[PDB]
Design a protein around this nucleic acid. Structure first.
Ligand SMILES: [Mg+2]
Ligand SMILES: [Mg+2]
Ligand SMILES: [Mg+2]
Ligand SMILES: [Mg+2]
Ligand SMILES: [Mg+2]
Ligand SMILES: [Mg+2]
Ligand SMILES: [Mg+2]
Ligand SMILES: [Mg+2]
Ligand SMILES: [Mg+2]
Ligand SMILES: [Mg+2]
Ligand SMILES: [Mg+2]
Ligand SMILES: [Mg+2]
Ligand SMILES: [Mg+2]
Ligand SMILES: [Mg+2]
Ligand SMILES: [Mg+2]
Ligand SMILES: [Mg+2]
Ligand SMILES: [Mg+2]
Ligand SMILES: [Mg+2]
Ligand SMILES: [Mg+2]
Ligand SMILES: [Mg+2]
Ligand SMILES: [Mg+2]
Ligand SMILES: [Mg+2]
Ligand SMILES: [Mg+2]
Ligand SMILES: [Mg+2]
Ligand SMILES: [Mg+2]
Ligand SMILES: [Mg+2]
Ligand SMILES: [Mg+2]
Ligand SMILES: [Mg+2]
Ligand SMILES: [Mg+2]
Ligand SMILES: [Mg+2]
Ligand SMILES: [Mg+2]
Ligand SMILES: [Mg+2]
Lengths: 104, 122, 127, 205, 52, 147, 52
RNA sequence: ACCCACUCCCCGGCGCCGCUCGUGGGGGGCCCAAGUCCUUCUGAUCGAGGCCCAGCCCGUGGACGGUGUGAGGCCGGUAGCGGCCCCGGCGCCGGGCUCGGGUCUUCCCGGAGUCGGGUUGCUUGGGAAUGCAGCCCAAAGCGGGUGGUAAACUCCAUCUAAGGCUAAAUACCGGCACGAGACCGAUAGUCAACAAGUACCGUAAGGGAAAGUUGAAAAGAACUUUGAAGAGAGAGUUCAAGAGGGCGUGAAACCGUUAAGAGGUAAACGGGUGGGGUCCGCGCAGUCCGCCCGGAGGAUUCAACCCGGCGGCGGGUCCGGCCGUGUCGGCGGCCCGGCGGAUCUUUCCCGCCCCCGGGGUCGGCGGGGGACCGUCCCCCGGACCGGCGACCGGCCGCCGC
RNA sequence: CGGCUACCCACCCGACCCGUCUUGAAACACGGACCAAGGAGUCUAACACGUGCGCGAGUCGGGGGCUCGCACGAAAGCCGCCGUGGCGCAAUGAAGGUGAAGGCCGGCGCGCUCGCCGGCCGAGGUGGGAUCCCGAGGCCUCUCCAGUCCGCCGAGGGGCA
């Protein structure tokens, strides 16, 4: 959330819940136990402030002075489409799926 | 992004049980028990699964809709087949042969459907 | 959840302060709930136990609907005694059995000048 | 003791050091105490700003830092006299005074008296009764603000002369050189020797 | 890269008429190793010292 | 990480990775840099030449502020000012040169490196090297001395 | 008592880990494989109005 | 001491109303919500649910005690929650002191057996001696100290020592209270979880231990019998005495008994068999499973095909629309759009400054305003992917109803 | 009926009692009567190398400050005219100090064991050097015609580290 108006009181008694602010994002609360992918529930303003707090690849962040979004290594992280694309298989080798086991 | 998600789910993920020398993935939408990339049902854009019906007879088939992604409310379409031992076995085979829709794991789905029908018979 | 930085959550400290509590705190600890028809009458939830009030066991081995009366409040043992809740010894003599006041529900209270004041104070605080 | 290859080390652990080791386990508590003290002082002195006493313009002494300017302790008595306010009243006004500092440059004297005049013009004080002069009818609704942060009126942020661009003159190609600095150093080194030589030459005449 | 639109849901559960675009932070490189390293090295900051 | 250290895999070995013939004695060779001139002279002369003795004259009460003189090179002389200055000078509207003051950046002496652009500059510094002074004038620049 | 308890991490690496966790929380597979029950959730990033 | 133009205030008690930032400090008591149905258990806090508004409260789901494993049974916890008592300041009604600023004229202006030097010790990183001390020598007022290499000549910079007071950020293993723990869990942790600096030891300084667990509740075994008693046989309480007064659980070394086996080269041990015994699985001439087909008898709806019809898949038109990547364009959101730039505009402004109130840019300083630059906001026109961004219209081919 | 084994017994063969000092241990060399619990390469500072991560001629807020009083908060978030500062970007002398651009073309002064001028790109050359580029030549149904179709290579060139 952002701009608290009493939401801590309403969410302070439910077990297993976690209260987090956009201006103060904690890794210990976002990825507990060292595993990513925790279910999140956002607000309209909390979701609109992310573009200004971290910035995009075109413009840097406005809240943070000298911070930019991390660089992206593999532009296409799907190995299946790359291996099955015609440009890759255009100059490949024969499969040669023969076993050639030991002969007595 | 199937391989990117598999590089995270292959370990350090829930549902995984490897107490003995064998490992099991145990997803709610999965045909076999092996923790593999070709059989994981949470990371692909197209996934087929079979399940025993909740009423006590028949087989429910869950298919990944692929129309709206990142929307797990309607991301899976569930149908119910309650026929003889061969009509369901042929309908499930057609459901994967006629449409492309992940042509592999067809035999896996068929074997799981036959195995759950064997248990539904008594 | 606890928020006052002056009250502790230590199990050992809580157990120590409960087992070595003074006599004026033991009487507050040994409190018993009131019956349903009396709770709506007095607008109070619980009330400490005294020697004259009647009470009815709700849980334990000597539980039932038989109305009883307390005869001793053993503050040292955090227990009360009832004249009808008793047991036979080896030689056959009777002896009272101890039941915790939290496991018993009150049905009658001694209308004392201080008891009425405590009741009205609790009612006005519950508002 | 030594090994195949490594930097020779001289650790200063020969003394009995374990009985005097300062661990900073009370650092968050100390920071919290300092923050609470700052907040309490600001709340008690609310009409006055935090770090109330205005500090003058101060140049660094050493040649390593004499290019930048920084804050200081107090204004000099000469600066107070050019400003025209009494020495003892500046303390209760909110002007820190440093009687030990002297003034050697009018370039800094004018800057300091200008800073003092700006502070005096921006200053607005509260009276006991409206019978005191040098004030207004309404005090700008608590002066639009009660307390200031990081400097009373203005920090010591550095300014720089622009000197954007200009046309090169004719003799600039042969105006200065490394030989100029070399000759300057040689003259500074052999100044007195030449004087003594001229003296002993005029002695013979 | 593609950044689709995400509809907003009202307090009653249905989707509201408004719609907001997906921020660029959700397309950042997913690095479980970096997350684990940061978590391991940051969880050691809140612990209290113990000694004989 | 004790579970990742070596002492865990050394359990069961009596010598604990230190040998049966020569045990791990407490400082068998000496404490610290013991015997730097004898029975360690081979190592001290093979890996640390010049360690023993005094060389230069002593300077009592040396202050690191007097000898403070950072150096800037000609290849970095253009990294101090903004980029638009270089293109505005390269436009060459007339015989005007941009002024690059290194005192603002924090350098007092300018040292010589090659490959200067063909644009005239006006440099202001406290000290100049001979090579740099000739190389900036061979392009049409000017050197200004400050204090 | 003077053991090295705390470990400092670069702010850039901290922000990298935060963006990595935020990007991983937007994928349904990574959050389903953690243990959360998101089978009936309409949209994975649940963006609600400011009334809450 | 004249001249000039000014200031009516401050400091110490006494009675009171309203507050002081967590809504000043201390103390006592109080304040939400199941103990309802069914079933295990000695005992319940266990076990599924409480109509379509999810049995009730929650700013109170931390913890403890209660016959076990409690958010709701009981102190307690949340709450700028309430009411009561005690202490300290902020505003107002008697009393005692009470001329500041500038120019000019006149006068005054300073700490001694101390600095310093010689010498001898200690100390310092301080070296021709940093500081301190003992002895001796022991001053000046344009003076004295310092200027990191001793000495002479000259100049320069800074200070006024041999008199004193003062809160601040700083430290705290003792003391009085409090909170917390990725620490220890009774040979561990302080020596000391318990009648521990106790018992005990040495004349004394001093040394210094071991030692937790019945049971939910003593409900601690009535009574009969044997024995003088210790003890035991019945009986009795408890779910349990296989928990019987250093008694939870109850290992090894060792010992007793019962059962089996063996015995002249001490016992033990590895490789390979045989015999006996406990136990395990099977019921031992009698037990293998699933698929297809040809036959022997009965009952059922569907499947072929068509129709109604929903749900998903695939591409063609990218069709009415969505956005991504680039180039111009409305110079338009520049004043009813944001950043940065040692890129500019002294014929822009404000406050200073030079020369002759005013004039002269003749030049410079700080702030503000605006022109060009590289990154962002809307519609039209088109360039590429229509790809993990998606809808409709039409089609082939699927599934269930 | 089948059953290896942590049950017992017997025969055949082999079989000296473990640990460390030692060239040499079963030794007439040392320690061990037996059993249960405890028991020994830790932590801090500094250095060197290697590896993982983030940024990159820059890097680092560990020191302080800011937001709201907080169980988790002795955490986490931010400073942006807080980068003061440490390391690296420059080395060489005891010091005063100094302090890193080459190559091609033409001309003139005796193109002189000879400097300067003008134009250009701009960190030299040789021998090796992964990789890359060009490439004679031939390799696919009856034929002169082709762009893909089958598909390697003699030699040569610029040449990472
Ligand atoms: Mg404790
Ligand atoms: Mg060695
Ligand atoms: Mg020592
Ligand atoms: Mg070995
Ligand atoms: Mg070793
Ligand atoms: Mg050795
Ligand atoms: Mg040896
Ligand atoms: Mg309990
Ligand atoms: Mg509880
Ligand atoms: Mg209660
Ligand atoms: Mg003198
Ligand atoms: Mg003097
Ligand atoms: Mg001198
Ligand atoms: Mg000298
Ligand atoms: Mg003094
Ligand atoms: Mg003094
Ligand atoms: Mg103090
Ligand atoms: Mg531990
Ligand atoms: Mg003991
Ligand atoms: Mg008898
Ligand atoms: Mg027992
Ligand atoms: Mg026992
Ligand atoms: Mg026998
Ligand atoms: Mg051993
Ligand atoms: Mg030896
Ligand atoms: Mg020998
Ligand atoms: Mg041996
Ligand atoms: Mg021996
Ligand atoms: Mg012997
Ligand atoms: Mg022996
Ligand atoms: Mg052990
Ligand atoms: Mg610096």
């Amino acid at each position: 959330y952002n701009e608290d108006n009493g939401i801590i009181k309403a969410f302070r008694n439910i077990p297993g819940i976690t209260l987090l602010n956009v201006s103060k994002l904690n890794i210990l609360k976002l990825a507990p136990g060292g595993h990513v992918g925790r279910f999140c529930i956002w607000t309209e303003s909390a979701f609109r402030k992310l573009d200004e707090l971290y910035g995009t690849w075109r413009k840097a962040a406005s809240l943070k002075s000298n911070y930019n979004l991390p660089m992206h290594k593999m532009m296409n992280t799907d190995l299946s489409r790359i291996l099955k694309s015609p440009e890759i298989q255009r100059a490949l080798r024969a499969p040669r799926k023969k076993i050639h086991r030991r002969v007595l | 992004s199937a391989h990117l998600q598999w590089m995270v789910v292959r370990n350090c993920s829930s549902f995984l049980i490897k107490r003995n020398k064998q490992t099991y993935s145990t997803e709610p939408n999965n045909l076999k028990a092996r923790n593999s990339f070709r059989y994981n049902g949470l990371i692909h854009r197209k996934t087929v699964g079979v399940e025993p019906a909740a009423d006590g007879k028949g087989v429910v088939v869950v298919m990944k809709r692929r129309s709206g992604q990142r929307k797990p409310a309607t991301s899976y379409v569930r149908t119910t087949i309650n026929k003889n031992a061969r009509a369901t076995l042929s309908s499930i085979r057609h459901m994967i042969r006629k449409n492309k829709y992940r042509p592999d794991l067809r035999m896996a789905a068929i074997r799981r459907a036959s195995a759950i029908l064997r248990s539904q018979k008594p | 959840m606890k928020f006052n930085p002056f009250v502790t959550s230590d199990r050992s400290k809580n157990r120590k302060r409960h087992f070595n509590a003074p006599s004026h705190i033991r009487r507050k600890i040994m409190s018993s709930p009131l019956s349903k028809e009396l709770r709506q009458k007095y607008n109070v939830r619980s009330m400490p136990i005294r020697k004259d009030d009647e009470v009815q066991v709700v849980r334990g081995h000597y539980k039932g609907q038989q109305i009883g009366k307390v005869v001793q409040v053993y503050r040292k043992k955090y227990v009360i005694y009832i004249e009808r809740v008793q047991r036979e010894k080896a030689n056959g003599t009777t002896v009272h059995v101890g039941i915790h006041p939290s496991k018993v529900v009150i049905t009658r209270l001694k209308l004392d000048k201080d008891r009425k004041k405590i009741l009205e104070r609790k009612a006005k605080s519950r508002q | 003791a030594p090994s195949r290859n490594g930097m020779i080390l001289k650790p200063h652990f020969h003394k009995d050091w374990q009985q005097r080791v300062d661990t900073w386990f009370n650092q968050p508590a100390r920071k919290i105490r300092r923050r609470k003290a700052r907040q309490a002082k600001a709340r008690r002195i609310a009409p006055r700003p935090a770090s109330g006493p205005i500090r003058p313009i101060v140049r660094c002494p050493t040649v390593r830092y004499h290019t930048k300017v920084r804050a200081g302790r107090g204004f000099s008595l000469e600066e107070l006299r050019v400003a025209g306010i009494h020495k003892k009243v500046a303390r209760t006004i909110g002007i820190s005074v440093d009687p030990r500092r002297r003034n050697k440059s009018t370039e800094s004297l004018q800057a300091n008296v200008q800073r003092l005049k700006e502070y005096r013009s921006k200053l607005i004080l509260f009276p006991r009764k409206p019978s005191a002069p040098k004030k207004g009818d309404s005090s700008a609704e608590e002066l639009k603000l009660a307390t200031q942060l990081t400097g009373p009126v203005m920090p010591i942020r550095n300014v720089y002369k622009k000197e954007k661009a200009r046309v090169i003159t004719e003799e600039e190609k042969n105006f200065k050189a490394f030989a100029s600095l070399r000759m300057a150093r040689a003259n500074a080194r052999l100044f007195g020797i030449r004087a003594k030589r001229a003296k002993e030459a005029a002695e013979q005449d | 890269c593609a950044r689709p639109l995400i509809s907003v849901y009202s307090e009653k559960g249905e989707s509201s008429g408004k719609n907001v675009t997906l921020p660029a932070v959700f397309k950042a490189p997913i690095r479980p190793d970096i997350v684990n390293f940061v978590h391991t090295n940051l969880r050691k900051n809140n612990r209290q010292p113990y000694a004989v | 990480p004790s579970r990742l250290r070596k002492t865990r895999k050394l359990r069961g070995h009596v010598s604990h990775g230190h040998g049966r013939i020569g045990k791990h004695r407490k400082h068998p060779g000496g404490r610290g840099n013991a015997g730097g001139m004898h029975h360690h002279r081979i190592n001290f002369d093979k890996y640390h030449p010049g360690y023993f003795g005094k060389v230069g004259m002593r300077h009592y009460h040396l202050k690191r502020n007097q000898s403070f003189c950072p150096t800037v090179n000609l290849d970095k002389l253009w990294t101090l000012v903004s980029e638009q200055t270089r293109v505005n000078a390269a436009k060459n509207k007339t015989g005007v040169a941009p002024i690059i003051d290194v005192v603002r950046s924090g350098y007092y002496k300018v040292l010589g490196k090659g490959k200067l652009p063909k644009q005239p500059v006006i440099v202001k510094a406290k000290f100049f090297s001979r090579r740099a002074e000739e190389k900036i004038k061979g392009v049409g620049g000017a050197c200004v001395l400050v204090a | 008592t003077w053991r090295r308890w705390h470990r400092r991490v670069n702010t850039t690496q901290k922000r990298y880990a935060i963006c990595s966790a935020l990007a991983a929380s937007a994928l349904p597979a990574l959050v389903m494989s953690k243990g959360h029950r998101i089978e009936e959730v309409p949209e994975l990033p649940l963006v609600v109005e400011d009334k809450v």
